[PDB]
Symmetry: C4
Subunit: 326 residues, 4 copies
């Protein structure tokens, strides 16, 4: 019973466990296609704002949608205010923009799994996606809940990290993230988690069979991790901290030892810490590096688009003064 | 002979080796039941004071019994004094209290494995549990001890970490702890130990078959470790350091770099160091966080009580400036 | 598909993963032969300059060729200038010198995989080797690439880290290095790499069957790593950082906390950082230590030459104030 | 060939890889017998001085022989002087003393594997053991070695770390130590080594079959490591650094930040660094702690003597402010 748990417990993998092995390549990074199609939503880069009151309000959602990415407007706010922030994006030269059929920068919003009133006004606020957004979407009341899909345009649900959780959310997009957060403390606090490669891998072997997109939430520290996230079955990454500290991040100007910062903190005992991160200036750059690394990665793998990166990328398992690392 | 030891030595696990994988859940943390029944002793939280002259005298035993937990009054003292401290708890609105059939806050006491005189006065001091308390309870004289069970109400024995040690203590409660102590130095000093998950797992596959409770002693650094301790067959955790530094801890006020501390040290060449830990204020909180994490964990696992947490919890094996982590 | 990548991903090894196990030995280090024959090029020590504008221009190539080693003159410069630097070595008591059939210190030069004009002037500049030198030589245009072998004397190609990449470069010498660089950031930046023992091992099981030499590029931090590099199928090591900071290194005098330095940086989003390393004085020593360690290693393995070191060396896998470590 | 080395390389273990699992015990530490019989030499504690010019001259050899242990008088000195130091011990209430049949404190001396003249005067200096003492005793000239056993009383040979090396030294005592030294740099310098448990295990499965004692040389940082050393087939430990810094150590008084030190350095490119270690005062204590830990360990294992510790000890494999850790 108890020893069987340990004798037979399988081994799970994160980003720093693996490396991508380079294949023969007909592709150069200039020639890549990083577009991804989250259930009809057509992104031109595979990046999604983490719906945190430190990461994504209107400025982010506009800037990132403009870039081909997707803002999830957070739900630590009034409906009057959320709806206002949805229609601010809809009411905003930008060549690789992500846009609804009405030309408008597309956007999404976070809704909690018992909040039906917010989900309505959202729909009327012409939101492109609703994110049923909680800590344990495999809570069986959350699964029930169907009722938000009777309400509807596209329904993203999370977070989950299991084969079984993905089966039960039948039901438009899934996100995976139980533990991965940089400022998340779920593992410390409740002993609970799955290393994010194994999590995304397992969840995607279910989800692929129904052409259900995976967004892979938390633990993305580098461009390389994004290339791993996708090689294991992600269709996009949900970035937050790497996008915290930028100008468009709604986090609070801070100073310590004279240097600029902006806060970054958790949503919810808490399962998320309060902190600060370096001021980064305009998100654009931050995105154009991440994408720039994913292309170079795509070139190493001989992948001209994210589909081929999913079908070709293979893993192997692994165990001076610096002056300008840029 | 010698190479066979290494070729065939099995691999053992601690807390930082595993994570709990979340299941489908009908349960929320508010709905949880963390009660545990240590051989008729009915605790309303699965927490046990470590019998150390830095951790548990009367103030702790009262406060923790009040909380649903259980004080083991330490044996680094005279019998006259131990017996006085037993009856102080018996002679002390507190809704989730752990209480003997006479309404009184229940309590326990540590007795060494050759001290028959102390074990008697204890019985007459109306103690609810005796802890036959030593470094190696699988010492075959200790096993002999029978004689303290002829003396008797409930008999807790420890510490042990093997299948075989559990067989020989047939015999009311077992505790496991050979190595785990934070300030314990058994591994350094005598090369000896078993990682505490494997220890509890193995010991519990014996003990479950006789409905013998496991208390899991040492190495609990976080609430998450408690949820792991139980998922591997613990019925309660024995906390000490995490409860050191609190107000009710009988350890000594200290200062270094202006900040408050209280000492924490080992019982007994020594197999335990002298140290200090931050002043924490009233134990209550410290307990209500640990329990708060165990509930959130129980909610992740779909466990409404500690039984289901034992039957459902599964493991997987694994390899920014902060401003308020509370 | 995705979980299969992780379930079945093999495990790869670097230098700090292994140790060489000592065999019975008829050999002492004085009696060793560290010569290596890179496709007719006859080196008297198995060391190759890394073609970096911080590591190898004329002074290095002369000094190292004199030592029995081989300078690759870098390609971050004009052809007029590269050709001048080739013929400077040709136009330069030195007992274990590496020398072309015309008595002259032999040398090599880096050429990019689309630069046909540079490859020509090179040939006319009487260069002994051309290094088709890029980040991903398994780019299928690079393989095409043939055309530089129709141009020709000896053709070194790199970098590659796979069985399959080695097959396609049929095809005179191979070098392996995808990730290993100290100041390389390929793994961070594009998630891509192979631990250098596995890389060299795999590449050499192909290359040996056609008597194709391996140069093993990057990650050499100690003399011991060189002995491992060769035991896994290298025929030489390509050193750079360990040779940076020396007098003959064309890197820039620097100071920080009063101590001498010279810069060291990457060739090419970038996949290489800017940095500095301690001033070392004349390369000779640096080389005579590395070689000195490789001999002591060769003596431990019972290997009188690099062939026997390849055929005998076996691995095992592994998991005070200092005042003069020399 | 090359990939086969890595695919099939076995995994080797050091001290920090394992823990000893406690068995049922009829034994208390007071009741233990730590005597060991190195080929007729009868030690009353299993400790051997490392023959280093920083560790063992006359003062050590007397003090340690008095304790039941064995001094190897080092060979970084003239024969006139070595012989003088042998007969100083012979020419020196001490209840557990190690003593030759003539009542005299027994002792040993280091001799290099080509130095026949030193080995003679030694014999005439009435030395109890000769240590054929080099870096690679599996050098096939060393094996030849025979000639020093024709010279003879007891012959200790080292260092070796392989099954095969032990076969060839047929054959009076073996010591194992290729890599383990704290100040040894063999792994760095020549890439060569075997983790010391696997080394001792393997060497002892040969040596036991001929009743050939193992001394286990280097890497002993704690009392616990000694208990592991023996459980894997050692018959004694060869201590050096842990015995450096003591009063009887012939190393040089030093100071840094006001605190007392004595140097400690290597014998012999070098394969040993120069350093210093804290002043410890009289060796006795240092020994009575190590032994004190080995007894507590022996008590945990149910071993009344070193034989039973070899036959019972089993391994498992593994992955606050301090004020007085004594």
């Amino acid at each position: 019973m108890f020893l069987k748990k340990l004798i037979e417990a399988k081994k799970a993998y994160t980003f720093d466990d693996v490396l991508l092995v380079p294949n023969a390549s007909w592709v150069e990074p200039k020639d890549t296609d990083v577009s991804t199609d989250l259930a009809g939503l057509k992104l031109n880069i595979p990046i999604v704002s983490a719906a945190m009151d430190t990461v994504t309000e209107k400025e982010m959602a506009i800037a990132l949608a403009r870039l081909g990415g997707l803002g999830v407007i957070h739900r630590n706010m009034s409906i009057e205010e959320q709806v206002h922030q949805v229609q601010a994006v809809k009411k905003a030269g930008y060549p690789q923009a992500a846009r609804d059929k009405k030309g408008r920068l597309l956007v999404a919003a976070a809704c909690g799994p018992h909040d039906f009133e917010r989900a309505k006004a959202l729909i009327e606020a012409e939101v492109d996606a609703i994110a049923i957004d909680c800590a344990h979407a495999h809570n069986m009341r959350v699964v029930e809940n169907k009722e938000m899909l009777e309400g509807t345009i596209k329904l993203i649900v999370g977070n989950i990290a299991t084969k079984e959780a993905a089966e039960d959310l039948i039901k438009d997009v899934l996100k995976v993230g139980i533990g991965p957060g940089s400022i998340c403390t779920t593992r410390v606090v409740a002993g609970v988690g799955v290393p994010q490669l194994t999590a995304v891998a397992e969840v995607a072997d279910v989800a692929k069979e129904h052409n259900v997109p995976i967004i892979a939430d938390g633990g993305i520290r580098y461009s390389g991790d994004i290339a791993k996230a996708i090689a294991a079955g992600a269709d996009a990454v949900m970035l937050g901290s790497l996008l915290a500290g930028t100008d468009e991040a709604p986090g609070q100007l801070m100073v310590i030892n004279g240097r600029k910062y902006k806060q970054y903190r958790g949503m919810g005992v808490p399962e998320g810490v309060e902190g600060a991160v370096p001021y980064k200036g305009p998100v654009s750059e931050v995105v154009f590096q991440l994408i720039g690394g994913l292309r170079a990665s795509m070139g190493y793998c001989g992948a001209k688009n994210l589909k081929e990166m999913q079908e070709k990328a293979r893993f192997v398992i692994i165990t001076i003064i610096i002056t300008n690392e840029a």
